[PDB]
């Protein structure tokens, strides 16, 4: 994967400063971005969007609701992209854990604007209990 860089000289240094795990000590590497960039192309999405914070925000917004039935490929993508998006918004995370949660807080304020469907719902969906 080498169609076009995604992170800048500055973001690159901050990208390698992001830990993959909460307790682990393994930082992030291009292998993680390059992989996603070559993945989006398979999801009918151009890798030229990852270069812009707006592109990611839009990509994640699609996988978010797909997390329910998203194969491993979807998981790795969301997690990875999540860490990248944070960088584009000049946000420094402690790990792939605090990064995923951080994106939930910044989006929470947005969901409040479109929380008309969540409430006053009238459609009993299938209920499960298998963890």
Coordinates of C-alpha atoms in Angstrom, one line a residue:
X1 CA 0.0 0.0 0.0
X2 CA 1.5 3.3 -1.2
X3 CA -1.1 5.2 -3.2
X4 CA -0.8 8.3 -1.1
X5 CA 0.3 9.1 2.5
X6 CA -2.5 9.7 5.0
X7 CA -0.7 11.3 8.0
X8 CA 1.6 14.3 7.9
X9 CA 5.1 14.6 9.3
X10 CA 3.6 15.7 12.6
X11 CA 0.7 13.3 12.8
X12 CA 3.2 10.5 11.8
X13 CA 5.2 11.1 15.0
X14 CA 2.1 11.2 17.1
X15 CA 0.7 8.1 15.4
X16 CA 3.7 6.0 16.5
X17 CA 3.1 7.3 20.0
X18 CA -0.3 5.6 20.2
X19 CA -0.5 2.3 22.1
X20 CA -2.4 -0.5 20.5
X21 CA -3.4 -2.1 23.8
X22 CA -4.3 -0.5 27.2
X23 CA -1.7 -2.4 29.2
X24 CA 0.5 -3.5 26.4
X25 CA 3.5 -1.5 25.2
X26 CA 3.2 -2.0 21.4
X27 CA 2.8 1.4 19.6
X28 CA 1.0 2.0 16.3
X29 CA 2.8 1.6 12.9
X30 CA 2.2 2.2 9.3
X31 CA 1.3 -1.5 8.9
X32 CA -1.9 -0.5 10.7
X33 CA -2.8 2.5 8.4
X34 CA -1.6 1.1 5.1
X35 CA -3.7 -2.0 5.8
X36 CA -6.9 0.1 6.3
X37 CA -6.2 2.3 3.3
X38 CA -6.0 -0.9 1.2
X39 CA -9.2 -2.1 2.9
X40 CA -11.5 0.9 2.2
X41 CA -11.0 0.4 -1.5
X42 CA -12.7 -2.9 -1.0
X43 CA -15.6 -1.3 0.8
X44 CA -16.4 1.0 -2.1
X45 CA -14.5 3.8 -0.4
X46 CA -11.4 5.6 -1.8
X47 CA -8.3 5.7 0.4
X48 CA -8.0 9.4 -0.3
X49 CA -10.6 10.1 2.4
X50 CA -8.5 8.8 5.2
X51 CA -6.2 11.7 4.5
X52 CA -8.9 14.1 5.7
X53 CA -10.5 14.0 9.2
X54 CA -13.8 14.4 7.4
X55 CA -13.3 11.3 5.4
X56 CA -12.7 9.1 8.5
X57 CA -15.6 10.6 10.4
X58 CA -17.8 9.5 7.5
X59 CA -16.3 6.1 7.2
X60 CA -16.6 5.3 10.9
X61 CA -20.2 6.6 10.9
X62 CA -21.0 3.6 8.7
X63 CA -19.1 0.9 10.6
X64 CA -20.4 2.2 13.9
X65 CA -24.0 0.9 13.2
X66 CA -22.4 -2.1 11.6
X67 CA -20.4 -3.1 14.6
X68 CA -23.3 -5.3 15.6
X69 CA -22.7 -7.6 12.6
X70 CA -19.3 -6.5 11.5
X71 CA -16.8 -9.3 10.8
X72 CA -13.2 -9.1 12.1
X73 CA -12.3 -7.0 9.1
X74 CA -14.8 -4.4 10.2
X75 CA -13.6 -4.5 13.8
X76 CA -9.9 -3.9 13.0
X77 CA -10.9 -1.1 10.6
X78 CA -13.1 0.7 13.1
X79 CA -10.5 0.4 15.9
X80 CA -7.6 1.5 13.7
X81 CA -9.5 4.2 11.9
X82 CA -10.7 5.4 15.3
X83 CA -7.1 6.0 16.5
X84 CA -6.3 7.8 13.2
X85 CA -9.3 10.1 13.3
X86 CA -8.3 11.2 16.7
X87 CA -4.9 12.3 15.4
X88 CA -6.4 14.3 12.5
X89 CA -8.4 16.3 15.1
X90 CA -5.2 17.0 17.0
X91 CA -6.3 14.5 19.7
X92 CA -3.8 12.5 21.7
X93 CA -5.0 9.2 23.1
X94 CA -3.5 6.8 25.6
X95 CA -4.3 3.7 23.7
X96 CA -6.8 2.0 21.3
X97 CA -9.0 1.8 24.3
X98 CA -9.3 5.4 25.5
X99 CA -9.4 6.3 21.8
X100 CA -12.5 4.3 21.1
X101 CA -14.3 5.8 24.1
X102 CA -13.1 9.3 23.4
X103 CA -14.8 9.1 20.0
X104 CA -18.0 8.2 21.8
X105 CA -17.9 11.3 23.9
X106 CA -17.4 13.7 21.0
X107 CA -20.2 11.9 19.0
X108 CA -22.5 11.7 22.0
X109 CA -23.2 15.5 21.7
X110 CA -24.1 14.8 18.0
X111 CA -26.5 11.9 18.7
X112 CA -28.4 14.2 21.0
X113 CA -29.3 16.3 18.0
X114 CA -30.8 13.2 16.3
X115 CA -32.2 11.4 19.3
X116 CA -35.8 11.7 18.0
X117 CA -35.8 8.1 16.7
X118 CA -34.1 6.5 19.7
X119 CA -36.9 7.7 21.9
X120 CA -40.7 7.2 21.4
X121 CA -39.7 4.0 19.7
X122 CA -42.5 1.5 18.9
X123 CA -40.9 -1.6 17.4
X124 CA -40.1 -4.5 19.7
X125 CA -37.0 -6.0 18.1
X126 CA -35.6 -9.4 18.7
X127 CA -34.2 -9.8 22.3
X128 CA -31.2 -12.1 23.0
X129 CA -29.0 -12.9 26.0
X130 CA -25.9 -14.7 24.7
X131 CA -22.6 -13.0 25.7

